RNA sequence: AACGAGCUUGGUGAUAGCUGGUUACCCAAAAAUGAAUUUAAGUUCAAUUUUAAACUUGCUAAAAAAACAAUCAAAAA
RNA sequence: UCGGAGACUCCGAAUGAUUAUAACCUAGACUUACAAGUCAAAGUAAAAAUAUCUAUUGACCCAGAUA
């Protein structure tokens, strides 16, 4: 085993272990893939879909599960399993990455409190006027 | 054009083309708009916007440049991170 | 017999082994010639080429 | 070119499938290329004439033409225009049907 | 066959009977007949007919089209740009399927070229092979592949199936020997050292996420795990895998070939390897 | 033995948008308008023409209605 | 050389004044040998949408300037 002056052992003396790089981190932090159910359908390119039951989603914190459900109830299937899909690439890996990330965003946004809503856009402004107009209309 | 050079006996590239035009492997040629750096203070904003763009060449102009450049300038170049990576091919063209 | 492997679908060609030692020694053995060498499609343009 | 290694389950992840055993009993045999692929190639001339050609045909090429004509007629709705090069042992078909013919030849086991 | 049977009946093939393939040749038109003689296709009297018309790109005297367009740097520095002959995972899997690459052994540029999987031209600025994301889904092979450039998604395919992907820089002199080893051994010169990447490439090959050969070994675990979470797969334990030594095998940063040190000489005729005993040369090579 | 600048050899097969010439048969298709140019005794481009290939509507005609015998043109034939 | 008017005869120009200052990006088109020159939805961004008439040209090379 020829070892040059630039061999990784000399460059990084602390991490001289042969299996240091090829060992698996302890982890324990994370989305349990086993809990989720992942089905790939080709719509001539792939389309990913992740369907995990909210009731059986013990990994998710129970209080936050309540908040996520109502906030995005539309995405919740009739059986009660959140249904989320993405179709933006030919590689199931990248499409799947979108599916997983949206779960993280939903958990993060639910866990965190967006104290400031600030202003609304034109679409919401029109809806607010419509609701206000209806309220005065129902005089009886 | 040098059709047969004395030392090697090959066709010679015209370097006036190499310094003005870009060839995509499909056969298209790119060019700038003449005067895009000239007298900008009297050109309208819409006029300047057109000049900044890169423009294609016709069949005749493309045919000419292919006669004035050698095959080396008509090969495939596998540059990592190339900003012209997607433009070297024609897609969904029936003709 | 062919030392190399003949394709299964093809059947080897055969020839009559002869000996020049004797005038009447016309046939003394049998041979199996590889089909892809001795049975290729007849094309006279390649011979011309 | 190494002889392809035996695999437990066919087709391989790439898609390659070896010739079927026993061999087909049809009058014509289509041999594989030295890279162990079906000799079906998309060709083009003049920049707009699209064709597909079978190259390593053996036996009675005329039977192959008749079989291909029936196979491709329902899809197009017309009898395909074809050329039979007896000397070269090739069959030429107008238009690109590489995918359809490769599977069609795969079923027969050629 | 039936066609072969016809030849038996026909007369003997001889040098007289030779015929060119139909339509292979063309008639060469000469100027001796009315259609092709007289003015001989050159028109009336004039410059083009005297044989002395101007050069290409000359538009009569107005400023030519090719000279009147601004010079731009489309092609500037082209001869020094780095080229990596890309390799997709479809081609990799296809090569492994047909037995033209040995997955059990470590993979390198030499074994890609040997199996004709890739074609490399060092004289045309090729600096190696870049793995590409095309074909990741169909890729279900565990292999230790060394490629000069890698991609995020390409790494996922190798890692998910339980494989090792590493990126190493080969300088122009090193690459030529790597693609074409045998002739170098015929030259009789000693094996050379492999220079480190130039300043421009130093950040890339020292980066853990890019799986650089000079990257810190300690940071690999974390980088692999983050990628594993991103693409929704669980890291496999390579150490438990029986072929841990083979997968983990990595050549020294100054080595062109795994099992050969710089400064050695290979004698194919005698089937021997010669190693210098001089202390001075050993110092230089060890560096 | 014809000096606005000798003659001989070499450069040299000088160069000529100019003049002259450019050798068998047969079948077929086939035009001097626009632009730029020390350009108008030239060349280049458009337009025309032609050989091949691809696939599908084209020519004459084209009612009403527009913009005013034309520019445009729908079912038809 | 360019453009306005008349049907070749006349007028102008290599623009000036007014301008609480006029973004970027991008469907489809006009014009046209080429080169040049025209109009513009959507999207996005400043601000609280088009500068104002009359009309106005000069390529490449190569030298100047600046952060
Ligand atoms: Mg000739
Ligand atoms: Mg001039
Ligand atoms: Mg190459
Ligand atoms: Mg005319
Ligand atoms: Mg003149
Ligand atoms: Mg002239
Ligand atoms: Mg133009
Ligand atoms: Mg808009």
mmCIF file with all atom_site columns, C-alpha atoms (C1' of nucleotides) and ligand atoms in Angstrom, chain B residues 31 33 55 61, chain E residues 65, chain G residues 31-37, ligand 7:
data_model
loop_
_atom_site.group_PDB
_atom_site.id
_atom_site.type_symbol
_atom_site.label_atom_id
_atom_site.label_alt_id
_atom_site.label_comp_id
_atom_site.label_asym_id
_atom_site.label_entity_id
_atom_site.label_seq_id
_atom_site.pdbx_PDB_ins_code
_atom_site.Cartn_x
_atom_site.Cartn_y
_atom_site.Cartn_z
_atom_site.occupancy
_atom_site.B_iso_or_equiv
_atom_site.pdbx_formal_charge
_atom_site.auth_seq_id
_atom_site.auth_comp_id
_atom_site.auth_asym_id
_atom_site.auth_atom_id
_atom_site.pdbx_PDB_model_num
ATOM   1  C  CA    . UNK B 1 31 ? -24.329 36.278 -34.095 1.00 0.00 ? 31 UNK B CA    1
ATOM   2  C  CA    . UNK B 1 33 ? -26.436 42.739 -33.839 1.00 0.00 ? 33 UNK B CA    1
ATOM   3  C  CA    . UNK B 1 55 ? -29.646 36.218 -33.516 1.00 0.00 ? 55 UNK B CA    1
ATOM   4  C  CA    . UNK B 1 61 ? -25.363 32.567 -44.358 1.00 0.00 ? 61 UNK B CA    1
ATOM   5  C  CA    . UNK E 2 65 ? -21.496 40.121 -44.261 1.00 0.00 ? 65 UNK E CA    1
ATOM   6  C  "C1'" . U   G 3 31 ? -40.347 45.797 -43.393 1.00 0.00 ? 31 U   G "C1'" 1
ATOM   7  C  "C1'" . U   G 3 32 ? -36.243 43.680 -46.008 1.00 0.00 ? 32 U   G "C1'" 1
ATOM   8  C  "C1'" . A   G 3 33 ? -31.349 40.620 -51.017 1.00 0.00 ? 33 A   G "C1'" 1
ATOM   9  C  "C1'" . C   G 3 34 ? -28.020 41.029 -46.787 1.00 0.00 ? 34 C   G "C1'" 1
ATOM   10 C  "C1'" . A   G 3 35 ? -27.120 44.544 -43.016 1.00 0.00 ? 35 A   G "C1'" 1
ATOM   11 C  "C1'" . A   G 3 36 ? -30.231 48.216 -40.744 1.00 0.00 ? 36 A   G "C1'" 1
ATOM   12 C  "C1'" . G   G 3 37 ? -35.035 50.004 -39.108 1.00 0.00 ? 37 G   G "C1'" 1
HETATM 13 MG MG1   . LIG H 4 .  ? -31.347 41.875 -41.444 1.00 0.00 ? 7  LIG H MG1   1
#
